[PDB]
Design a protein around this nucleic acid. Sequence first.
DNA 1: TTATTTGTATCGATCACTATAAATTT
DNA 2: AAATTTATAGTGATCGATACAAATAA
Lengths: 192, 191
Amino acid sequence: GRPRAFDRDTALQRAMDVFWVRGYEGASLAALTEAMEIRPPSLYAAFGSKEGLFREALAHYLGQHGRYRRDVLDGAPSAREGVAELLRETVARFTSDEFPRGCLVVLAALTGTPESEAVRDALSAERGESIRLFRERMRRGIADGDLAADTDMEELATFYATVLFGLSVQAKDRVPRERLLAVVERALRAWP
Amino acid sequence: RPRAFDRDTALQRAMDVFWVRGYEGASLAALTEAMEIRPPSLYAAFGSKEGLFREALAHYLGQHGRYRRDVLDGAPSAREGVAELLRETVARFTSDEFPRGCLVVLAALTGTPESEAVRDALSAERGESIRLFRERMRRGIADGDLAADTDMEELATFYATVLFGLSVQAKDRVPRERLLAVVERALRAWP
DNA sequence: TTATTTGTATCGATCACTATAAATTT
DNA sequence: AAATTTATAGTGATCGATACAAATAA
């Protein structure tokens, strides 16, 4: 067939930014096409629909802005330092001038119309993973000796995931990076 | 002609639609069908979808935001104030009488530029949450249950962060026991 | 062919919102 | 009657999603 006249991954990144800022439903087809510099028929050719475009953009976001999460967790000598460096780097990215403020998974679709309930549920599932990720590192901690064997791994994981989701909301509110880092250290104070 | 609907009950229904669907996600169809009124009546009473949301937000704050300051000021220490506030808030977030999560956090975090006002409004209210903590801690400094050199803005922001995160978690159907454990864990960070 | 993409033109449905007039009070 | 609030029906605009034919490949 005719060769594609646009980079698919670049269009995915630009569609991902529009979602990151306006949310799944707030990002209209007009705003998407104007940012991806393509036309609606070209979009539906490639991606399939707004829902499908968002699922590809979320998969792309998790592979580009979700890699550092597991990398800094497993790259620390202790589970506490893993959680510490993860929260610090997550605040650095939430407050960086290169990326939109906050996490896409948290801000994109918390509520909305029934039509998007699938998208919403999808994001919810990903938030669940944010807990499991924490838990897994803590598990390794228990094996490494830096964490007690009887610690409630899912309680700590849920707590630090709660702090993570709260940090997205605070970063959307333009809370200074210094105060968000102070919040991270305060949250680390709650470690057993 | 007498109006065929009570304004406060219509605001109740409208705020429920906003609580589940958010500001832009709540269409006029879903709003009018829940309030059991017609679009001309809605626009004569409130003037605009944004006006309806502002009235519903004021009503929601007078109904589900008045207890915050009362529970904070009703405790002997700032620690117990924050503790009982978080525990009560979890109890409401996990009850089946109200939609799970706080409306101020869930209604509009992102959206179209056209709704910038609404979002900013909610943001302001979120700020007040921090203030509600800060003020109490100030009293805690005077009463002597909090150190004078306590970094209040870090502590207030931390517990407000936990509060906003609890709204998100309550939306994700996290059980009440898990959220209560999260609160008791967040209290361990207290100085 | 045989197939696929691209730009122009939309499609019906739904959005927030309202002009007009009947209905219901004093 | 006079003063409001309804209900009907529909406003332009925009929503996500497409025909259609020209355009570019195997």
